């Protein structure tokens, strides 16, 4: 099964800086990685699909990059409402799996 | 119309149906098998086309019994289609050569 | 019945026999070669079908001399079968076009 | 000249055009997709040939929607070409056998 | 003998020659390219056969310009051979159906 | 040849807990892994075939998971009669090979 490693588990940034979340797959999975945001007591929300594709309604300061085993979710200039947990999820092989999450702290 | 052209068009229609149905059924068969990659519909449709044409890059392939049975139906539909079209072409060329030589 | 249909049916029967015999013989040839994957019968039968149809995903392939000779017989049986069927189809279409035009 | 030979030559010309145009368009479609390998023209031309002949080693394959659509046009041009040539060959052989038997 | 059978046998002979010559030339073209695997004759002969039949597992493939040109000649010899045989089969079936119906 | 690593070699559990045996293959072998139980002075007994498929006569508290290189045999709520050595075996490539075994201790 595809193991997804998100490290580090906690990211500490200053307001308005660029932040990057890492997600590493235990084997090559093309661009089949999707990124979700979960705020406190909220349900997950899709941010980026297929490693880099935008979702309507998501602010444009979110972007994603990478292919193969190494994936990055990026926030241009973080702000308070970005405080949340961030999960990656692969859909290359069955079963779908999730990474363990990175918390954003400001 | 002539039978060979009706048969070729029929076969093209049936082939399109086999590609779509096979894509749906491949995903249905392969989800639940750990390691399977034929598990989302867009790339399953692509796989069904490169299987029907007998190209088979190997970027995707089924691992279950039912996914492989579906693959076999897709291969045979593709090869039969291509055979039907070749035969219809031959029939057209043979008849036009008969006429051109005066029967 | 007509010769082209008898030949096509014969070829389909022989092809099924070649697929089963080739699966058995592929496992027999490949066991004993370190690294070989064509070594259990269900997936060997699948390999023989995708070889006969000339799809060749490459998920499985023989590495020994005898396993590759078996593969060649399977390829040729599959290509010959498909050629026989195309030719039988052509013969049917040509004869029906002869009749439809009044000979 | 006879229609089947004109059609075969036409199809060979069109196939060459499809191979070159498909190589150009494959690179155009695939650049910009992370991970894509069909992104320089010499190896894209090689890929288009092994796709048209339905060999499909799998050393290269498209990953985008448009690169895969181009692949489908290339497959169909190659299979149609080969069908056209087989049918032209059949037409030639049938006519020469008609003459050899005295019509 | 009849032309279609002479042409088919000729094509089978030429195909065998193309397989052997292509195996020799593939090794000659590919040695000297770092990473190339088509570099010893037994497995090059196997590669040439699975290329001629258009199976293309992808266990082996050429990387140089000349090795790929050789591959193209092998593909075309294999596809042409198979087309020639299909056409010869069609010609045989058409003539026997003519006789069986009384011309 | 496929090397199968079973680690740890000894697993110590409490009655009724869930236990997991690890088996790692030196290269990817799909789901071609089979699991055997061997009690003291007994012959091996097939528990799970093709990574996750049940065998008739085997209690349902046994299950297996994984694909690729990483495989897990699981026992829901272990009991005394599960005390035994546990072996994985691959059939993806010739020759078939065995892992070195994990002993269950309660
Ligand atoms: C029950 C549903 C079965 C039908 C599934 C619908 C598929 C939708 C395709 C269009 C959406 C694009 C999404 C995407 O990113 O697609 C490409 C990868 O980027 C995948 O390439 C492909 O979808 C391959 C296309 C093959 C063309 C086949 C033509 C047959 C003559
Ligand atoms: C001497 C013996 C030769 C015959 C071998 C018997 C094979 C038995 C197959 C059914 C058992 C299922 C086990 C299993 O899990 O099978 C699939 C993988 O899950 C493998 O897929 C396959 O077996 C591929 C099937 C190919 C269909 C070929 C049809 C030809 C027109
Ligand atoms: C818009 C441009 C489309 C045309 C692209 C031009 C390609 C130029 C090829 C010659 C330059 C050699 C560079 C090189 O190192 O090439 C080989 C690898 O070493 C790659 O093998 C190939 O180029 C494969 C050749 C396939 C032959 C196809 C014949 C069709 C019947
Ligand atoms: C200029 C020389 C060109 C001819 C090369 C001579 C090749 C000799 C083959 C026999 C020696 C066995 C060594 C060996 O271990 O061979 C197999 C791997 O174990 C490889 O499988 C193969 O050689 C594949 C055989 C393909 C059969 C092709 C039949 C065509 C209808
Ligand atoms: C080959 C046509 C029948 C395919 C049925 C697939 C259903 C899969 C269920 O697991
Ligand atoms: C090609 C038909 C003969 C195959 C015989 C296979 C026997 C393998 C023994 O090692
Ligand atoms: C299938 C013929 C049309 C291909 C057009 C490719 C253009 C790619 C643009 O992203
Ligand atoms: C395609 C026929 C000619 C092949 C010549 C190969 C010679 C390779 C020299 O590097
Ligand atoms: K192929
Ligand atoms: K093929
Ligand atoms: K292939
Ligand atoms: K392949
Ligand atoms: K590969
Ligand atoms: K063909």
Numbering used by the authors:
A (entry chain B), F (entry chain B): 1 to 106
B (entry chain C), C (entry chain C), D (entry chain C), E (entry chain C): 22 to 124
Paper text:
The simplest description of the gating cycle in the pore domain of a K+ channel requires at least four distinct kinetic states. However, as a consequence of allosteric coupling between the inner gate and the pore helix near the selectivity filter, opening of the activation gate in many channels leads to a series of structural changes at the selectivity filter that renders it non-conductive (the O/I state), a process known as C-type inactivation. In an attempt to increase the resolution of pore domain states where the inner helix bundle gate is open, a set of cysteine-bridges between adjacent subunits was engineered, using the lower resolution structure of KcsA-OM as a template. This experimental approach, combined with targeted mutations known to affect the stability of the C-type inactivated conformation, allowed the structural determination of KcsA in its ‘transient’ open-conductive (O/O, mutant E71A) and deep C-type inactivated (O/I, mutant Y82A) conformations at near atomic resolutions (2.25 Å and 2.4 Å, respectively). Trapping KcsA in its open conformation has allowed the development of an atomic description of its O/O and O/I kinetic states.
In this mechanism, water molecules would diffuse into the inactivation cavity by a conduit formed by the apposition of two neighboring subunits. The entrance to this conduit is guarded by Tyr-82 (Thr-449 in Shaker). For instance, replacing Tyr 82 in KcsA with Alanine accelerates C-type inactivation gating, while in Shaker T449Y slows down this process. These experimental observations suggest that this position could work as a gatekeeper, regulating the diffusion of water molecules into the inactivation cavity. Thus, a reduction in the volume and/or hydrophobicity of this amino acid side chain would maximize the diffusion of water molecules into the inactivation cavity, increasing the rate and the magnitude of C-type inactivation. In order to address this possibility, the crystal structure of the closed Y82A mutant was solved at 2.25 Å resolution, PDB = 5 VKH, (Rwork = 0.1749 and Rfree = 0.2037). As expected, a smaller and less hydrophobic amino acid at this position not only creates a septum or a channel that communicates the extracellular milieu and the ‘inactivation cavity’, possibly enhancing the diffusion of water molecules into it, but also allows the solvation of the inactivation cavity entryway, as evidenced by the additional crystallographic water molecules detected at this region. Interestingly, it has been shown computationally and experimentally that recovery from C-type inactivation is in fact, dependent on the occupancy of this buried waters into the ‘inactivation cavity’ and that as predicted, changing the water activity at the extracellular part of the channel slows down KcsA’s inactivation kinetics.
